[model samples]
Target: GMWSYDKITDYLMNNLGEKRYKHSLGVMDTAVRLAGIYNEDTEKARIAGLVHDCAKKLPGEKIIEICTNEGYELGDEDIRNSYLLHGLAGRILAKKVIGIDDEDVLNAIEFHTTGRPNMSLLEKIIYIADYIEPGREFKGVDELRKAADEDLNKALLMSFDNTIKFVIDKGGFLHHNTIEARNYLISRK
Candidate 1:
């Protein structure tokens, strides 16, 4: 309940690896800007974005341990891939370890990676910010950033397009949640 942004940054600095810590900082800044553009809560976006991947650096066993111990259900795919589990693990950590109780912020962290059918403004901001953070240098990120500035839903749909293509090309399992998110955005837009 007493956790503040400053304290969270300090904790992340020591706990997260240097590269991931810097990525978190970039996402925080990006999320704040997106939040401002979308008229959402900047403070909530900043904190949620910063801790969105707090479990990214954890060992596979540790991630599973935390998730299962917290009674957070894990899909079979997530069990085989900690990459997918990191989002929920991060949310659990954000709640228990970081003391953040805000539902919007928690939802943002939990679904930052595998977006759901419906997402709050804060959730969309965090997900987009993580994707288009200045530190990220992937093909067509510029276009997505531009789309983000213009419209959050369109940007999210465009991102899902890229995500699906990338995951399929890599022979990775594309989670159904992502499909639902894409369909929802397509239907809404």
Candidate 2:
């Protein structure tokens, strides 16, 4: 049997608050559309997007505990900012809790927050979907949504740039993975 959106919705509703659950729904819708535009599997995109932030609402200490107990290597940055650890934790939760075993889906969830270089199409779709979902309201989001319809890589680069700028403005740690992703995308174009 395949994973259904309904089941995922039930899981997310139980795990997340109303706002986060709604955000996940928006991500799923956007991911499905992006998958259609990019000629990927819409089901995969939807499932990945739905579960991408499964661990987002977990307490910081709990996140650290799970990662440590699960033996997931926690970088200094991950330790410093536990929120960023949600993606990796979500990936594990999606597997252990949600029964998602698809490597592409798991990878998409794992790196949605801190993207990697040369991401798969599914990863790109989920990443962009999480950013451009309907609930997202911020500067440059409209442009990002428009770019998403036209080009995936272009939208990804724009999103990465926006994220980097936001991190800089907030005086936050800019993960090296994000920089590497931006550089990789730029080199491709």
The residue-by-residue lDDT of candidate 1 on 22-46, one tens digit each, is 9999999999998888799888988
Residues 45-81, candidate 2, lDDT per residue (tens digit)?
9899888999999998898888888888777877887
- Write down the TM-score of every candidate: 0.95, 0.94
Prediction 2 global C-alpha lDDT? 0.89
Give me the candidate number with maximum TM-score.
Answer: 1
Q: Global lDDT of each model?
A: 0.89, 0.89
lDDT of 1 at 186: 88
**Stretch of 10 with least lDDT, candidate 1:** 76-85
